Amino acid sequence: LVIWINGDKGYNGLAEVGKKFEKDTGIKVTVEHPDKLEEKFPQVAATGDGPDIIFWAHDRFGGYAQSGLLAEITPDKAFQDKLYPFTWDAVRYNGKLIAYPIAVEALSLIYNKDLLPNPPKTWEEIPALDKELKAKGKSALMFNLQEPYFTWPLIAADGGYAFKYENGKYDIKDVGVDNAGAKAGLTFLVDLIKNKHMNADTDYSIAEAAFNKGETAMTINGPWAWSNIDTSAVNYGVTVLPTFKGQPSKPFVGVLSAGINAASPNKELAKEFLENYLLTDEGLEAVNKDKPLGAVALKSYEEELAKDPRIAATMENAQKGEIMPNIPQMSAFWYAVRTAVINAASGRQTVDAALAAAQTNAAAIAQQWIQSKREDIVNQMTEACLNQSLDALLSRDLIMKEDYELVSTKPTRTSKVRQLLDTTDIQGEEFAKVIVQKLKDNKQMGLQPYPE
Amino acid sequence: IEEGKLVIWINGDKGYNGLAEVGKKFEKDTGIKVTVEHPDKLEEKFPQVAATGDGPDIIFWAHDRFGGYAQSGLLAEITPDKAFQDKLYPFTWDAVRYNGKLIAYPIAVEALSLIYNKDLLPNPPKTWEEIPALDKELKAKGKSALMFNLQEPYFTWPLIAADGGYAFKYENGKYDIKDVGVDNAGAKAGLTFLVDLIKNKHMNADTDYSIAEAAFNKGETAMTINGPWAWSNIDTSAVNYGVTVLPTFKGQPSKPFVGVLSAGINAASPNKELAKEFLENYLLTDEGLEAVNKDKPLGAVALKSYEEELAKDPRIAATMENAQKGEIMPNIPQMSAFWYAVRTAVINAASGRQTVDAALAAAQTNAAAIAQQWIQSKREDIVNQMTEACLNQSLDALLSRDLIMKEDYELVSTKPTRTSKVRQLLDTTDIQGEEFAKVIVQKLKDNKQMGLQPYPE
Amino acid sequence: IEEGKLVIWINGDKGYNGLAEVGKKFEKDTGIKVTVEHPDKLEEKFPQVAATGDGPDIIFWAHDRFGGYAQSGLLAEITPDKAFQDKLYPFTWDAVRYNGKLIAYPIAVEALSLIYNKDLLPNPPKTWEEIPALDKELKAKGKSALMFNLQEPYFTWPLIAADGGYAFKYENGKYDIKDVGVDNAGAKAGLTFLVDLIKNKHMNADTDYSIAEAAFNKGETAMTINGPWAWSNIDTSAVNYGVTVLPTFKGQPSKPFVGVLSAGINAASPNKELAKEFLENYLLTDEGLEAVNKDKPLGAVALKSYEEELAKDPRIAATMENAQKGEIMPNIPQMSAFWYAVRTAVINAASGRQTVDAALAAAQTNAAAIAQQWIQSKREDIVNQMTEACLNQSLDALLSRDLIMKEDYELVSTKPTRTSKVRQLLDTTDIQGEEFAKVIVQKLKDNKQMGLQPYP
Amino acid sequence: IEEGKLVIWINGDKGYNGLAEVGKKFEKDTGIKVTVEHPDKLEEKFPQVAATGDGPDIIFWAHDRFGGYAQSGLLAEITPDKAFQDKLYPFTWDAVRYNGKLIAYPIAVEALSLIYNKDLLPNPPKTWEEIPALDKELKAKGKSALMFNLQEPYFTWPLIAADGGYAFKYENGKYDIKDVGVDNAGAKAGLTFLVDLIKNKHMNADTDYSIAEAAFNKGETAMTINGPWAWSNIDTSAVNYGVTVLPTFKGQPSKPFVGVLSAGINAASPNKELAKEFLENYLLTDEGLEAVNKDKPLGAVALKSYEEELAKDPRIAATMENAQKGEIMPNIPQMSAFWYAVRTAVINAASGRQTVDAALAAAQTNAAAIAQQWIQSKREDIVNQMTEACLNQSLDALLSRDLIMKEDYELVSTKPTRTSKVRQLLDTTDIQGEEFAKVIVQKLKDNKQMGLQPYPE
Incomplete structure (x- = not known):
């Protein structure tokens, strides 16, 4: 078995689940974490080769499924009850289950209690807060501006959206990255950068390093990041994302899913690994210990994780946000918005121009x-x-x-x-x-x- | 506690060495030795130690804390004869009356006043709104406009109450303990303005009493807000100063809380009758009060005979004018909770950890x-x-x-x-x-x- | 790093807003904008960032760290003309001389002093041995005798060195890197006494700088140990205070390490000539130094012309008297290892995880x-x-x-x-x-x- | 000052009302009215007022201050005939002789004694070293061992001088003004022991004369150190008491400084001949001295005829035994500086601001x-x-x-x-x-x- 999973997640934890599988049933497991595995998978699996099993958020999977890349999984309905019912809906493409839901994940406001004991509940007070922290030789907020996943919460808040829900299925022609709500959100993000509160070319490694060293008071990130913060022991709390124009930030909610490659010979060997080794209370905590999964899809193990207030904060954000579509249009939407965020942030384009370009591109x-x-x-x-x-x-x-x-x-x-x-x-x-x-x-x- | 001797507890800012001389007169006359101590946080030390048994024989503090001590059974119910009750002012007795029972002897009425440097600023401002402008001008000459204690909420409250904040609403006769007004727009407006002065570098968030008095007495700032007790140190430095009415906010005047420095006897003391002799016949007399007042001013005293002299001084006339425009503190037990609830909200908003709307919303629930x-x-x-x-x-x-x-x-x-x-x-x-x-x-x-x-609920 | 502008790094406890005003004079005059930053652990951040390339143009710290930066090739070898070398004191140049090469500009000599509350304690103790007794008396009146930063070894070192501890022995000309004296009986005796004060509830093991200054400035303790920079905040609170000689231990005087606040230029900066104008012609002048000194005192400055004024102040006279009795820090690269070796030994012994004999024996091997x-x-x-x-x-x-x-x-x-x-x-x-x-x-x-x- | 009348200044602790009766005899006989006043700090008021001109006609104090007044030209050089000089003791004349000139009339020799309560303590201690032990026992019965005036250095000096302290060394004929012995180990040892008694809660640092006498006379303490003058008040309270020798320290006896209460005439008075009649023919007589002694004891008088009676009393016998073991005060002008130098060192060390080694080192330079x-x-x-x-x-x-x-x-x-x-x-x-x-x-x-x-130097 060859497993592909993102580098930010707990891959060494999943490697220990493989060594249990190797020790028990004899089949050796290799957990790899290649860069751009969301874009490498549809290339290599289309020809034939690649991983046996793929770990990513559920949004990319319906695009792989329409392309015939993923094996149509058939877990028995005694096993379907062990995971939450809405996590199955996340991995259901045209009445067909295409991957196993592992964990629900959503972005949260992560703040330094020593530098800032009462964190802001509005985006509009962050410019003011930064000016005060600049005097003491620090900054208010710092997060990954490159990926649109992180900046989307602000964009969607006032009224932006990827594809409108037509009470039952998504309207692929009604895209809302152009609307005033979306402009308002991105404008505010650009304004923070223009007024020297944020820096346009801040990536994930810059952000985590700054907050974990104690150089900034706030960051926006998922569960996975908590592991490194504990190590540095910056007295921190996880809480709800700040509001914009009164309305709350709406982060896109991912369901980390595990789909099996349709071109693999080891389809039955992967189902044993997923159902009987990974999706169990022992297996999930081995991953969660390395780097947190989030709020898991497995009912039995979520019972424990629900007690932790960090997960309670994560679910509160996910409630206020909305679940990602799994449809094939999302891949186009994402790298359309990626450009618009980066161009507007760096100041090559205006917000009105950048989002107007992404509007046609996403559609x-x-x-x-x-x-x-x-x-x-x-x-x-x-x-x-x-x-x-x-x-x-x-x-x-x-x-x-x-x-x-x-x-x-x-x-x-x-x-x-x-x-x-x-x-x-x-x-x-x-x-x-x-x-x-x-x-x-x-x-x-x-x-x-x-x-037209 | 020890029978035979008297042990007096009084705040450090007041004239304790003056009250010590009243003790040496009591020692010389009737033989009983007196010890005047001034421990830190005596407002919070008293309910701890007196609840068990030990502590002072007699306690000196503003009347607001006393009804909380009285509900806790800590204070002895005093019974001065009605020939003595006429010697003090009638409304000062109302300040120390808890559920139809007199719980301490009123010593002096005290209220905050605007204290300004006549040489640096001969015509002082009659509005808060012109202080930002005035500071910018004094910054050019290497000085500041205003500087006072931001830590304690007593000093910042005048600004908060001005536009329409209040501790507990009066239900024409008794206080409604459930109707708290630290949250209302008037209260927000006042604190917002205080935060804005700090944000625009006119004031400094972590300015305590010792910073403030030292600055004004050295001649480094043109104005301070303080009570009578502070006048003693200013006279020494001889900064040509005047005491006047507090500046208005949004047209309406600043409303400082008015304290009545009261002397209550400990219920767990053996020397209950020895304290009543000390209070009625030695302290509350014209000789006794001036010995204290000389060290550090009491304010406008409750004793009618000695107030006659102090009323002539225009500083006291200014103090009473502020006290008229302000309102008297409740004595009820809820006030202790109210005070340290507002203390936090002022300090958090000043330092900039919380917003004014958030800080006062927190203090609203806490004070209630x-x-x-x-x-x-x-x-x-x-x-x-x-x-x-x-x-x-x-x-x-x-x-x-x-x-x-x-x-x-x-x-x-x-x-x-x-x-x-x-x-x-x-x-x-x-x-x-x-x-x-x-x-x-x-x-x-x-x-x-x-x-x-x-x-x- | 950016060519055109100057970026200055200086410690937070020093007068950075004063140095910012010297930058605005430089901006107003020659046009080049200056930014004065004060990041935490700038002694440890500088060798990381400057080794790759980026960082500040100019770095402000005590002279001890600089020879370690110099051996690492991080600092630009400065060449002030010998007409300018006469304007500063000659022994301050020796503080910033690494292998016959001047590596930073000396700004000011600084050393620790006993700072006491005259109202709480008019006659301060001239021996460490009477402080336990003095504390018991002040505990009765609701106060404490002494309170200072136990976390950093700079402050506790005076006590350790007193009876006969030392970082590296001087071999009359250069330091013997193999002869380390944190283990010796003199060093044990000093630290033992510091541990005993904490064990007998006179001091508190986890007292940092902010705890100490706040306590003395509010009037909650009668004594603190601190440098010149701290005097600014004390004046504000107006606790009637005096600065004097550190108390003796076992008869011999406390020997504080003496720092020379130096300004070195980054070897990887494009603005090497722009920094030399800022240092020689704007900072190291009588106008420039007092703008810093007004915000938070520099100490006894290296500039002869401005020291003439500061020598009149008895606080500086007390500071120099301590510095005479003490000894000057080595600039060598071994000091960085020595410091964080002693840091641990002080904190472990104070908290009571290790004994003094065990803690210093560990730091002996580590410092060496x-x-x-x-x-x-x-x-x-x-x-x-x-x-x-x-x-x-x-x-x-x-x-x-x-x-x-x-x-x-x-x-x-x-x-x-x-x-x-x-x-x-x-x-x-x-x-x-x-x-x-x-x-x-x-x-x-x-x-x-x-x-x-x-x-x- | 006024010609015609006599104005006498004498210390409050002495028998001033007794001396007032000697004035009424002088008024009744020769017609000149006498006024006996007892102002505070008359040792320090006299050199101020008499230097300008005004003050008293005649001054009553111990002989030590007088040579300082004499060097300042304040005292009139008295000339009693040598028939009168034989009526007083010869060594009391030496006490008031400054550079071969008699400057005041000796009234009485006075020295400190151990005064103990016979009912609380029938066998009093003959060593200082057993007083800590004795106090622990009396603490159990709700009392204390020793209690005396720690403020004035006169009282604590006996302990200091015992082991080997001294004011100024005698160079067999005159005092060496440069050889001061408040610093030496003997002096340190004595004061250290006094500080240790206070540190171990046996004594209280801020105990004055009024505290001490009141405590012993009420029966709250078993011992006090005091002069003859104090005996009058003890008789009134009728605490069964005895007067005896001061306790030894390190084997050697306590050496109290011995005062000679002297009466000097003001050089700036017009009534120089009227005072000499009052002193020689009215005060220094057997009738006159007993009128004073009845009010408050003088001690062992300088007048030979009246000492004959007072020597029979064992209290005076105890007083003289202490005075023998002690040594006579110098009259020189340096003593005033010495006294207020030692006053500080005793009070600072007692209160615990300074150490004994530091305090006496300071007083060493100051006294010199x-x-x-x-x-x-x-x-x-x-x-x-x-x-x-x-x-x-x-x-x-x-x-x-x-x-x-x-x-x-x-x-x-x-x-x-x-x-x-x-x-x-x-x-x-x-x-x-x-x-x-x-x-x-x-x-x-x-x-x-x-x-x-x-x-x-």
């Missing part, structure tokens, strides 16, 4: 419209429309030099358009808008209803 | 003291009726919220029995505040201790 | 730092010449004595090669202390690695 | 008084020769060491000229002690005032 209206009528476009695109698209795309630097030549050196106009539509999926949504414009310019009225 | 008094009302019932599970549930939950110290937790649990553990828990509820008490009353309601009578 | 430096002297030879058996024998024996953490052991053994494992072992020897190193040097001697040169 | 007398020897030269720089340097340095009060500094500097400023500085050097003088003599030597003659 993917053209890129999905092309995908919906894929074969029709291959058959119905004229050789003029192809060249018009190829010219206009090259004039806006949207095609690389290798990608342009790889398209045009195909034998036929049928195969060229195919190779063009292969690169539309790879090269983003602004790429697709050009082609859909040229298809509408040349009046390819055989393609069905157009976007 | 609903749980802490509910525990006190059914004290012995809770000792008998609390389960050993409820005890441990409370002890666990209190330790998880850092409400118990490490010494206090171990001192409770190392008691021999549950009856004694719960007793020791309820002993620390009175000491450790009101958020402490809310945990226990929650656990008593969780375990359904129906023996206990109606619950708070 | 014989194995850890011997490993460093033959570092690459040990990487090449250590057997894989000797590695595992060391790793086993170190783990059995709880000297390696669980993370550090696994990080060593998961290296690819035996060459890289030993490297990672010797990387952790520098971090993890001297008792760690004694195990490895024992195993290298057990396996007879007679290619390594003379042993200890 | 090298600078203060050097200033006095070249007083007018220093007024003329001190620069205005040296004045200000002294005034600055003296103020930095808290040696000048705030009133004294301003009173010097507000003089019109430098000649008058230095005069006012040297006026306060005599009042304010010897460490004050060392500063000025340092500054005079710093500025190189070579006009002034040889310097001290």
Whole structure:
């Protein structure tokens, strides 16, 4: 068995669960923690190779499931009762369970009790608080601005959202990163950076190091981070995220899930490891001891963790927040918002411009419209429309030099358009808008209803 | 405590060496030796030591603490004859009357005044709102406008009460213990302005009494807020000064709490009749009061004959003008809780750990003291009726919220029995505040201790 | 680090807001903006950050840490002209001279003094031995005799050195790095007396700087031990106080270590010439020093012209009298090891985890730092010449004595090669202390690695 | 002062009402009215008022202060005929002889004695070393062993001198003013033992004369140390008491200083011949002395005829036995400096501000008084020769060491000229002690005032 799990989680703890599995049933386990395992998995598993079993938040899994990468798990309904019922809903894609829920996790405000005994319950008082701490040679807040997971709580607060819930399923066309609530949140984050309260290029390692050394009074982070703080022994508390414009911060709530690779031979060996070794009270605490899982999906072990007020704070944040969608659109949404946060923070773009760009990118209206009528476009695109698209795309630097030549050196106009539509999926949504414009310019009225 | 001798406890800021000379007159005349001591936190030391038995024969403090001592049975119920009651002012007797019983002898009325340096500032400000502006000008000449004790809430209260804050509402005859007004907009407005002065570098958050007096008496600041007692040290330094009315806030005047320095006799003393001779025939006389007043001013005295002289001095005229605009302290037992509730809110907001809205909201619940008094009302019932599970549930939950110290937790649990553990828990509820008490009353309601009578809400 | 601007690092207890005003004069005049920061553990943060590259342009600390920075190549070798060298005192230049090279600008000489409350105690004690008696009397009146910072060894050292303790012996010209005197009877006697005061409830084991100053400035204790910098806050509270000579122990006087607050320039800064203008022409002048001194006293300054004024003040006269009776700190790189070796011994003995004889015996070996430096002297030879058996024998024996953490052991053994494992072992020897190193040097001697040169 | 009438000054503890009756006999006979006053600090009031002119006609005090008044020209040089000199004892004349000149009339020899309660303690201790033990036993029965005036050094000196302390060494004929023995091991040993009694709760540091007499006369303590004058009040209370020899220390006996109560005439009085009639023919007679002695005992009188009767009383026999073992006070002007130097050292060591070694080392330099007398020897030269720089340097340095009060500094500097400023500085050097003088003599030597003659060392 080869297990892939994120580096910030308790991998050495999960390695000890593997050595128990090795000692008992004989099968050796290897727990690896490669970088960008969320992006490495869909590459390697699509061909065939990779890990037997993958550990990540439930949002990426429905995208893997639509791609046929994950094995459709079948735990018996006596086992389904041992885990919480809403954690199963997190890993249910089109009436099919695709991974085992391990633990619910959400972001919390983590504050230094010695530097700040009464922490702020509003974002609006943090600028003021920082000015006071600057006098004593410290800062108020410091957290990871690179990843959009951490900054999203602020963005969603006043009224931003990834995809609207249409009371039963998510509307893939109604994206809310553009709306005034979303602008207001990000504007405030940019303003903190502009007024020297925060620093635009602060990553996870900068943030944790600062708070754990006692150089800043507050950080925003999940359960996993608590392990390192205990070591440094900065007298700390975990509490509810500060409010913005009266309304509470809404962090996206992840369910750390374990899905089995569809291209693995060891499908039955993984189910023994998950159901009978990991998802047990002994197994989960071996992981939790190394680096906290959060509030676990296993009912029996959550009973103990609920007593700890840190988990009580984590669940209070998760209640006020909302659960991530598992749908395949989320991967596009995430790296669309990633850019908008980083550009606005560094000051290359404005907030209005950055989120307007991420609005179209997260939606993917053209890129999905092309995908919906894929074969029709291959058959119905004229050789003029192809060249018009190829010219206009090259004039806006949207095609690389290798990608342009790889398209045009195909034998036929049928195969060229195919190779063009292969690169539309790879090269983003602004790429697709050009082609859909040229298809509408040349009046390819055989393609069905157009976007707008 | 010792029979034969008198042991007097009085605050250090007052004229204790002057009162010591009244003792040497008593020693020379009637033979009984007198010892005047001035221990720190004598307001908090007295209810500890006198409850067991020992302590002073006679206690000198403002009248607000006395009704709390009286409800605790610590003070002797004094019986001066009605020929003597006419020698002191009638409203000063009302200050020391607890449930139709006189509990101490009124010595002097005292209230805070604006004390300004005439050389640095000949026309002092009549509004708080112009002090920020005035400070900026004095910063140019290497000085500051105002500087006073921010630690004690007595001094900062004038500003808080001005716009409409209050300790406990008067129900035209007695105080409503449930209607507390430290939370209201008037109270917020006052404290906000005090915080703003500190935030804009006009004042300094951690300024105590010794910092303030030293600064004004050396001529480093143009104004201070203080009572009569402070005038003695200012005369020595000879900073040409005047005492006047406190500045207005939002048009309305500052309302300082008015204290009546009272002398109560300890109920556990053998020398009850020896103290009454010392008070009525030696201290409360024109010779006796001026011996104290010479050392460090008493204020406007309760004795009619000696007030006649002190009324001529314009400093006392200023003190009484402030006291008129202000209002008299309640003597009720709730005040001790109110005071250290407001003490925290002022200090936290000043230092900038909490906001004003948060700090006063915390002090609102603490001053009201609903749980802490509910525990006190059914004290012995809770000792008998609390389960050993409820005890441990409370002890666990209190330790998880850092409400118990490490010494206090171990001192409770190392008691021999549950009856004694719960007793020791309820002993620390009175000491450790009101958020402490809310945990226990929650656990008593969780375990359904129906023996206990109606619950708070 | 940023070219254009100056970033100054100085300790929080000193007058940093005063030095900030010297920066605003520099900004107003020559245009270059100055930022005065005061981070915690700046003595330990500087060698980390400056070794890589970044950090402050200019560093303010006592001269003892500087020779360790200088041996590490962190400090820029300053070249003030000999017309400027005459403006400061000649012995203050000797304080900042490392191997015939001037490494920082001397700002001010500083030493500890007995600071007493005249109202509570008009005639202060001239012997340590009468303080237990004096405390019993003040306990009756609801106060204490003495109260000072027991955490830092700077403050408790005066007592330790008195009867005959010493950091490193002077061999009439240079310090003998192998002759350490924290173990000697004189040193034991001093620390024993400090422990006895704590054991008899006269002092409290976990009293830090903020506890001490607050107590004396509020008028809760009659005496404290502190430097010039503390006088500023006492004036504010206006506790009628005097500064005087430290009390004697066993007849001999207390010997405080004497610091020279020095300003060294970072070798990895682009603004080397901009700092020299700030130091020589703006800070080390009569206007500049008094702007700092007004905020929080520097002490007895190195600048001859401004010392002329400060010498008149009897507090400085008391400070210099203590400094005469004491002795000047070494600047050598061994001092950093000495200090945190004595820090532990003082705190353990005070809290009562160890005895004085045990605590100082531990600090004796640690301060000497014989194995850890011997490993460093033959570092690459040990990487090449250590057997894989000797590695595992060391790793086993170190783990059995709880000297390696669980993370550090696994990080060593998961290296690819035996060459890289030993490297990672010797990387952790520098971090993890001297008792760690004694195990490895024992195993290298057990396996007879007679290619390594003379042993200890 | 007034011509016609006599105004007598005598200490309050002595029999002043008895001496007033001798005045009414003088009034009835010769017509001149007499007024006997008893003002506080009359030892220190006399040299002030008599130096200008006014004061009493005749002064009653122990002979030690008189040679200081005589050197100051305050006392009239008396000339009793040698037929009258035989009526008083010859060694009492030596007590009042300053540089071969008789300066006052000797009235009575007085010395301290151990005065014990026979009912509480029938066999009194003959050693100081057993008093700690004796006190522990009496503490069980609710009483104390010893209690006496610790404020004045007269009473504690017996213990100090015992082992080998002394004021000024006798150089077989005159006293060596430079050889002072308050510092020596014998002196340290004595004071150490006195401090130890106070430290071990046997005695109380702040016990004055009124505390001591009241305690012994009420029967609250078993022993006191006091002179003859105190016996009058003890008889009234009728505590069955005995007077005996002072307890030994380290084997050697306690050496009390022996005073000769003397009556000197003011040099600035017009009634010099009227006082000599009052002294020789009315006071120093058998009728006159017993009128005083009846009110409050004089002691062992200087008048031979009346001592014959008083010698029969065993209390006087005990008093003389103490006086034999002790030694007679010097009359020299240095004694006034010695006394208030030792006064401080006793009080500081007793209260525990200083150690005994530190306190007596301070009093050693102060009693010797090298600078203060050097200033006095070249007083007018220093007024003329001190620069205005040296004045200000002294005034600055003296103020930095808290040696000048705030009133004294301003009173010097507000003089019109430098000649008058230095005069006012040297006026306060005599009042304010010897460490004050060392500063000025340092500054005079710093500025190189070579006009002034040889310097001290």
